[PDB]
Amino acid sequence: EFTVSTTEDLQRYRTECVSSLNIPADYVEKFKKWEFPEDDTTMCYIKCVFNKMQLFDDTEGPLVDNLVHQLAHGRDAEEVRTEVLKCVDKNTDNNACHWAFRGFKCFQKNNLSLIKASIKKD
């Protein structure tokens, strides 16, 4: 089942991906600041994190229902879906790392932020 990711999920996934991909220390510092070079190391890191957040599958590609759940904060879901779908394409160069990262870049361009604050009516 799909659950939305928080900052703490992201921190755990970063740690796991850094370990499993043997990411160099200097990349880790950038990643902690949410700064992402457009190189293979970084693109495969983004795929790894999106995999773990169930936002991207290496065969099916971007996972739209899950992305909408992650992005919408329970509001304007059909509008969010419209925006997400603009960012969905096929694996045109047969590199799942590039595929995932292309999605991410399109999210950034369209102001679709996967990790946002939430105000709770207490």
Author numbering: 2 to 123
What did the authors write?
Ae. aegypti OBP22 (AeOBP22) is a member of the OBP family of proteins that has been directly implicated in regulating these feeding behaviors. AeOBP22 is unusual in that it is expressed in multiple chemosensory tissues, including in the antenna, the proboscis of the females, the thoracic spiracles, in the male reproductive glands where it is transferred to the females during mating, and in the salivary glands. The monomeric forms of AeOBP22 are similar to other classical OBPs which consist of six α-helices stabilized by three disulfide bridges surrounding a hydrophobic pocket. Our results provide evidence that fatty acids are likely natural ligands for AeOBP22 and that the binding of long-chain fatty acids (C15-C20) is enhanced by a conformational change in the C-terminal tail that is critical to generate a high affinity binding site.
Other compounds can produce the same magnitude of NMR chemical shift changes, notably geraniol, citronellol and benzaldehyde. However, this only occurred at high ligand concentrations (typically> 1 mM) and binding is weak as exemplified by the concentration dependence of the chemical shift changes. Initial crystals formed in the P3121 space group, and the structure was solved using single wavelength anomalous dispersion (SAD) of a tantalum bromide (Ta6Br12) soaked crystal refined at 2.6 Å resolution. A native data set collected on the same crystal was refined at a resolution of 1.9 Å to an R/RFree of 18.3/20.1%. In this crystal form the protein forms a domain swapped dimer, with residues 116–122 of one molecule forming an anti-parallel β-sheet with residues 37–41 in a symmetry related molecule. For AeOBP22 the predicted molecular weights from multiple measurements of the R2/R1 ratios in both apo and fatty acid bound states were in the range 14.1–15.2 KDa, in agreement with the expected molecular weight of 14.3 KDa, indicating that the protein exists as monomers in the absence of other binding partners. We saw no evidence of any significant dimerization over long periods even at the high concentrations used for NMR chemical shift assignments (600–700 μM). Therefore, we conclude that the domain swapped dimers are an artifact of the crystallization process, and further discussions below are confined to the structures of the monomeric forms.
